[PDB]
Amino acid sequence: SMNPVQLDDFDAYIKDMAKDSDYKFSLQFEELKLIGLDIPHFAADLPLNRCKNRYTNILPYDFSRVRLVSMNEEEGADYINANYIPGYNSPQEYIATQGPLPETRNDFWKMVLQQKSQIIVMLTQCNEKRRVKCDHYWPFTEEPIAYGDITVEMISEEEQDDWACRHFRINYADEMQDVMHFNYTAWPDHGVPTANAAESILQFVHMVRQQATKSKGPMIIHCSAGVGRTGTFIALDRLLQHIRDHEFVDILGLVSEMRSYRMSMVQTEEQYIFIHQCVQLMWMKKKQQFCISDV
Ligand SMILES: [Cl-]
Ligand SMILES: [Cl-]
Ligand SMILES: [Cl-]
Ligand SMILES: [Cl-]
Ligand SMILES: [Cl-]
């Protein structure tokens, strides 16, 4: 479950991964399916926490789960469906979480505050094609809204074709924190995304990364399950940095590592292949960069 590939061999690699109706893609993916099967998630299974999980089979591992501050000995007080994930720069660079439910939106804001996260990435619209994905857990207007103990004011909201950016100021009594929220709204349909789809997503990943160099705390990433589009964005973000610095990539290693921190990161084979497609584009662009001589 690591397979590092030299970038000047990546073209031939993906052609081989693609032969026989993507057979080697499937085989790697079947390797990945096994990662984390015997890592405990006892907390995720507590009775009082059943209603805090969007899905019954997307549960946070106990070792990497994010804990909320607990006033109580009440069961599951500290629980949220979120895990820390390593990144390119730090071992707790990200938090991958499900899209908040109405019943957990308060818990979600508590996490943002307690974790001192200044960046939230949302890879879904609240509803898509008449299916619920995520509660609209932030305000609709500029008027501050109380979410349990934490008030959120939208300071600004900028909408583009494929994404929107929102500045939130959050407070808990005398404690105040500023948070940027980035919502990608054009996540492609099943199955082979266009060239423009891949380019749009890479542009989005680039913009979030620019804000991350200015900020501190974990970067919170969610979709609906907090595994599929979420793992994909995290993979892409790390791969962008990696490919800037190196002449090789290990995508298999990368997803294997992520699945050790949260189950089912990169949910589908189609997403796994999409990562490879995005890496082919990153490589093309780096090769364009090679035609400029500075040093
Ligand atoms: Cl950890
Ligand atoms: Cl850390
Ligand atoms: Cl403060
Ligand atoms: Cl890795
Ligand atoms: Cl996809």
Residue numbers in the entry: 914 to 1208
Question: What did the study's authors say about this model?
Answer:
Protein tyrosine phosphatases (PTPs) play a critical role in regulating cellular functions by selectively dephosphorylating their substrates. The ∼280 residue PTP catalytic domain consists of an α/β structure, and biochemical and structural studies have led to a detailed understanding of the catalytic mechanism (Barford et al., 1994; Zhang, 2002). Key features of the domain include the PTP signature motif, the mobile Trp-Pro-Asp “WPD” loop that in the closed conformation positions the conserved and catalytically important aspartate residue, and the phosphotyrosine recognition loop. Here we report the crystal structures of 22 PTP domains, including two tandem-domain RPTP structures and a detailed structural comparison of this protein family.
Structural comparisons of all available PTP structures identified four main WPD loop conformations: a closed state, an intermediate state, an open state, and an atypically open state present in STEP, LYP, and GLEPP1. The atypically open state is associated in STEP with a stabilizing 310 helix C-terminal to the WPD loop (Eswaran et al., 2006) and in LYP and GLEPP1 an extra turn of helix α3 following the WPD loop. The presence of an atypically open state, catalytically nonactive conformation, in three PTPs from different subgroups suggests that this conformation may have significance for the family as a whole. Structural comparisons identified an atypically open WPD loop conformation in LYP, GLEPP1, and STEP (Eswaran et al., 2006), suggesting a regulatory role in diverse family members. This conformation represents an inactive conformation in which the WPD aspartate is moved far out of the active site. Low crystallographic temperature factors observed in this loop region suggest that the atypically open conformation is stable, and multiple crystal forms ruled out that the WPD loop assumed this conformation as a result of crystal contacts. In the first category are TCPTP, SHP1, SHP2, BDP1, LYP, PEST, PTPBAS, DEP1, MEG2, and GLEPP1, which have a “PTP1B-like” accessible pocket that harbors a basic residue corresponding to Arg24 of PTP1B. The new structural data and analysis presented here suggest that a secondary substrate-binding pocket, similar to that found in PTP1B, is present also in SHP2, BDP1, LYP, SHP1, TCPTP, MEG2, PTPBAS, DEP1, and GLEPP1. PTPs with particularly high enzymatic activity against generic substrates were RPTPσ and PTP subgroups R5, R3, NT1, NT2, NT3, NT4, and NT5. CD45 and members of subgroups R3 and R5 were extremely promiscuous and dephosphorylated most phosphopeptides with reasonable activity. Surprisingly, sedimentation velocity measurements showed that all single-domain RPTPs studied (IA2, IA2β, GLEPP1, DEP1, and STEP) were entirely monomeric in solution, as were tandem-domain receptor PTPs (RPTPα, CD45, RPTPɛ, and RPTPμ).
